[PDB]
Ligand binder design. Structure first.
Ligand SMILES: [Mg+2]
Ligand SMILES: [Mg+2]
Ligand SMILES: [Mg+2]
Ligand SMILES: [Mg+2]
Ligand SMILES: [Mg+2]
Ligand SMILES: [Mg+2]
Ligand SMILES: [Mg+2]
Ligand SMILES: [Mg+2]
Ligand SMILES: [Mg+2]
Ligand SMILES: [Mg+2]
Ligand SMILES: [Mg+2]
Ligand SMILES: [Mg+2]
Ligand SMILES: [Mg+2]
Ligand SMILES: [Mg+2]
Ligand SMILES: [Mg+2]
Ligand SMILES: [Mg+2]
Ligand SMILES: [Mg+2]
Ligand SMILES: [Mg+2]
Ligand SMILES: [Mg+2]
Ligand SMILES: [Mg+2]
Ligand SMILES: [Mg+2]
Ligand SMILES: [Mg+2]
Ligand SMILES: [Mg+2]
Ligand SMILES: [Mg+2]
Ligand SMILES: [Mg+2]
Ligand SMILES: [Mg+2]
Ligand SMILES: [Mg+2]
Ligand SMILES: [Mg+2]
Ligand SMILES: [Mg+2]
Ligand SMILES: [Mg+2]
Ligand SMILES: [Mg+2]
Ligand SMILES: [Mg+2]
Ligand SMILES: [Mg+2]
Ligand SMILES: [Mg+2]
Lengths: 233, 52, 121, 252
RNA sequence: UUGACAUUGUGAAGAGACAUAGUUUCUUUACUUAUUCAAUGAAGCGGAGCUGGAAUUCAUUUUCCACGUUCUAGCAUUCAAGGUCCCAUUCGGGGCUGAUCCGGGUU
RNA sequence: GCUUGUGACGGCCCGUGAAAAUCCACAGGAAGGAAUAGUUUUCAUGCCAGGUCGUACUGAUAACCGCAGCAGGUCUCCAAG
RNA sequence: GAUGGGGAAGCUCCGUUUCAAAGGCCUGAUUUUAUGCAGGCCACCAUCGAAAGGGAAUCCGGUUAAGAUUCCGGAACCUGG
């Protein structure tokens, strides 16, 4: 107002240097970025077979939280905790004279791919969690089928990393309960039920459905309009 | 030239040591009329946008 | 939330932290002693006849000097080895592959006196 | 025998283009946002001879839309464009000599120059002195435009491919007899090393299919097959007719 | 140079058989992510929407283009002046708006 | 007058007759700056320092190349009556 | 002619700004302190290649058996600080 002036600029071609904007959409990314993005793209443009594709259908976030909440009680020993227990044993055991049985029956989540597989094969697993990332997917694609056949209730769950955290590994690939306190026996029946409904029951039908075959959006709209005007005059 | 005082490198007009005076008459004149004629064009098409 | 805002469409290599070297053992066990001290720099009076005359007449000392030595090093060594003050130092490479320094002392010193202090004639 | 002259050419040792004095390559503006939605103005700042070329170059400078600076371009001057002229470039440019416009935006009959073969290729068609292309039709669905090149050839290219209104300067350069060996000398001295020319019929057999014999002569048809091989292709390659052309040429 | 096979995938219409159900194979014309070519210091792409209006309303929009620069050999840069909200009023400095929204497919 | 330099011009070309380091100028106006005392080193004068390698001589009917102190060959500046 | 790279059994061949996350300046932030982060730039992306091309600055007189625009005398000029 005072000796202050309004002087709107004109950024409309042929005059005034263009201002700074967000060229985020346009940056020339390092190849490694480009490749992991195109890897994802290319991976759904292709029609993807039913035995893959059956992943992608991951567990939902509410049930998961309930499943992580249970599976967490049963974390395996911590190094301190086990050091703590070995002096409970070796001292007291080899003295007051217990049968390496002044230690309680441990209850813990079972892990390690090879381990869970023989567990599943032996019908000992009672709830299994398969991560959805696992880049050599082969490590793990046979597992829905496995569980399905061995009559084992399973779930494809978001987080190889997160499976890792509830077992003190960086990543984990699989988690499983063979065991359970009676204090928890019942809360798991419910979990095995919701899960079996979202997976095992659905498995035979999921086996028929290829995934992928998805256009990029510039192609999508190019047809959501081509096909709209063509027919509906 | 870096050995010699600033006044060997200019004349004391706008665009001193750079453009040749007559070339700067031209610049001033041309600037002025065009900035004037710009006022003109605006108010003319302002009237076109109000009477049509 | 959402994504950063890059005004530039160039992506440049992130400015990352650069730790200085902090070894675990050393380079050499023992640092090399000075490789060009004064006594290595100036090797010998040049006592040629026509050298001698520059001493008499030009208040100039002529030394054969290290090939590895420059005008600074010659000046400092003649200064430290003889208590003298140096005006300026010309040098040249001889054709026997050795270096000559023409060393002009300042007007306060008398090179003739100074040449039979070092002890030659 | 020996590797003949026209094969040695390709390794470009003594045969590369003499380049030192050249103004720089001639090119339309990079096809940015201005030129394909609006127009952008420049001034031809200098029109200038370019060694080895026959048509003069136009040096034309524009403001930079995204940064405070001038950006200069090298055009080939169409006849009649001049220093201090304003040059307009873009989809929505107006139809005068010197401007650059996409063939989609010009009526048939339009006479253009330095036209692109694909949009954005910064110009490829009709650049030599005197030359031009005529727009002779449009096909608005699948936006192509159909033009006639200087060779007589008709061709259809994208309607976004650009060109500049008018003809290239320096016409009729070839109307004038070179007169002497020396003028050819200086001609090619600024081009490449193609002059003068020994007839293969004057060489020995080692040197050429035409070489040798106790009289000079080709000794076999000099119309050579397309499928001939390196070392063989000398004379009338792939010639579908031969002999003095009688009667009017011109593509019907 | 010519053919076949491999790189080689996805729709659609038409032919081709167990001999007028669709597994399969060839031809035509679609798709784009493989592969291929160009451009650029990957800058304005695609899709909506704002407002002008041509347009004629068969109930209200059924749409289609537009949607800052052309007398002149000036000038166009300091996240932008303006508006507005903050820091606790110091000089300095920040956010939004100015410059519509969505999708990160550089084209 | 001779040699050389240089200027203002004129002829010539389908030939129109390098590049980079480097130096200055201008447009811009971020900023900084006085009255009880500030601004200024593109004005003058003043102080210190400038390393390293080559430098002799021949350059030709004998110092180079032609087996040689070979009538051969080998780029150039200065130029009196 | 290196380098990210691409060929080649390989000695190596190609490419030179190329299908690359390619780097360093100005001062401000420190008054634990020495240089971490705060701005904004600049994206120019090796290097070798001329003792006749480009290019900061020196002249006269004297002097040696043999050096000298290089020493001596005197008088200057440039570049950095
Ligand atoms: Mg526990
Ligand atoms: Mg003056
Ligand atoms: Mg001023
Ligand atoms: Mg004396
Ligand atoms: Mg020397
Ligand atoms: Mg070349
Ligand atoms: Mg020749
Ligand atoms: Mg001939
Ligand atoms: Mg001929
Ligand atoms: Mg012959
Ligand atoms: Mg032959
Ligand atoms: Mg033959
Ligand atoms: Mg013959
Ligand atoms: Mg004949
Ligand atoms: Mg074929
Ligand atoms: Mg681009
Ligand atoms: Mg002469
Ligand atoms: Mg001329
Ligand atoms: Mg100047
Ligand atoms: Mg500031
Ligand atoms: Mg001064
Ligand atoms: Mg000499
Ligand atoms: Mg002699
Ligand atoms: Mg001789
Ligand atoms: Mg190489
Ligand atoms: Mg060099
Ligand atoms: Mg030189
Ligand atoms: Mg030189
Ligand atoms: Mg003398
Ligand atoms: Mg002497
Ligand atoms: Mg001599
Ligand atoms: Mg002196
Ligand atoms: Mg003096
Ligand atoms: Mg000074």
């Amino acid at each position: 107002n005072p000796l202050t002036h309004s002087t709107p600029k004109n950024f409309g071609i042929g005059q005034a240097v263009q201002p700074k904007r967000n060229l985020s959409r346009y940056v020339k990314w390092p190849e490694y970025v480009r490749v992991q993005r195109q890897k994802k793209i290319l991976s759904i443009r292709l029609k993807v077979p039913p035995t893959i594709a059956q992943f992608q259908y991951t567990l939902d976030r509410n049930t998961a939280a309930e499943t992580f909440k249970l599976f967490n009680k049963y974390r395996p020993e911590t190094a301190a905790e086990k050091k703590e227990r070995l002096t409970k044993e070796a001292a007291a055991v080899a003295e007051a004279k217990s049968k390496q049985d002044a230690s309680p029956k441990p209850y813990a989540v079972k892990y390690g791919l090879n381990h869970v597989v023989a567990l599943i094969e032996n019908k000992k697993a009672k709830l299994v969690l398969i991560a959805n990332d696992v880049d050599p997917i082969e490590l793990v694609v046979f597992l829905p089928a496995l569980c399905k056949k061995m009559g084992v209730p399973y779930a494809i769950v978001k987080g190889k990393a997160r499976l890792g955290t509830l077992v003190n590994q960086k990543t984990s690939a699989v988690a499983a309960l063979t065991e359970v306190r009676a204090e928890d026996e019942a809360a798991l029946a419910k979990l095995v039920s919701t899960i079996d409904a979202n997976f095992a029951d659905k498995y035979d039908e999921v086996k028929k459905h290829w995934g992928g075959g998805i256009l990029g959006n510039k192609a999508q709209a190019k047809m959501d309009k081509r096909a709209k005007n063509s027919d509906s005059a | 030239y870096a050995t010699v005082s600033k006044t060997h490198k200019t004349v004391s007009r706008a665009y001193g040591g750079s453009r040749c005076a007559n070339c700067v008459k031209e610049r001033i004149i041309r600037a002025f009329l065009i900035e004037e004629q710009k006022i003109v064009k605006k108010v003319v098409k302002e009237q076109t946008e109000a009477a049509k | 939330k959402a994504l950063k805002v890059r005004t530039s469409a160039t992506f440049r290599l992130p400015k990352t932290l650069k730790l200085a070297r902090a070894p675990k053992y050393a380079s050499k066990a023992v640092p090399h002693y000075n490789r060009l001290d004064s006594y290595k720099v100036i090797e010998q009076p040049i006592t040629s006849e026509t050298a001698m005359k520059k001493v008499e007449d030009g208040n100039i000392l002529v030394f054969q000097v290290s090939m590895k030595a420059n005008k600074y090093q010659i000046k400092k060594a003649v200064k430290e080895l003889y208590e003298v003050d140096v005006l300026k130092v010309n040098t040249l490479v001889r054709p026997n592959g050795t270096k000559k320094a023409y060393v002009r002392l300042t007007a306060d010193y008398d090179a003739l006196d100074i040449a039979n202090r070092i002890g030659y004639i | 025998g020996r590797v003949i002259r026209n094969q040695r050419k390709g390794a470009g040792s003594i045969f590369t283009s003499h380049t030192r004095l050249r103004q720089g390559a001639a090119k339309l503006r990079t096809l940015d946002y201005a030129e394909r939605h609006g127009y952008i103005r420049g001034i031809v700042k200098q029109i200038v001879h370019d060694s080895g070329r026959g048509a003069p170059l136009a040096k034309v400078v524009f403001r930079d839309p995204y940064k405070y600076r001038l950006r200069e371009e090298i055009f080939i001057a169409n006849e009649g464009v001049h220093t201090g002229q304003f040059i307009y470039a873009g989809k929505k440019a107006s139809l005068n000599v010197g401007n650059v416009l996409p063939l989609g935006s010009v009526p048939e009959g339009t006479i253009v120059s330095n036209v692109e073969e694909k949009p954005g290729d910064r110009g490829a068609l009709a650049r030599a002195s005197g030359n031009y292309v005529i727009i002779i039709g449009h096909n608005p669905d699948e936006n192509k435009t159909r033009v006639r090149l200087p060779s007589g050839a008709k061709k259809v290219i994208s309607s976004d491919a650009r060109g500049v209104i008018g003809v290239i300067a320096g016409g009729g350069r070839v109307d004038k007899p070179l007169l002497k060996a020396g003028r050819a000398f200086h001609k090619y001295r600024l081009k490449r090393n193609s002059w003068p020319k020994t007839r293969g019929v004057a060489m020995n057999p080692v040197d050429h299919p035409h070489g040798g014999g106790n009289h000079q002569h080709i000794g076999k048809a000099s119309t050579i097959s397309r499928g001939a091989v390196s070392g063989q292709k000398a004379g009338l390659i792939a010639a579908r007719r031969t002999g003095l052309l009688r009667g009017s040429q011109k593509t019907q």
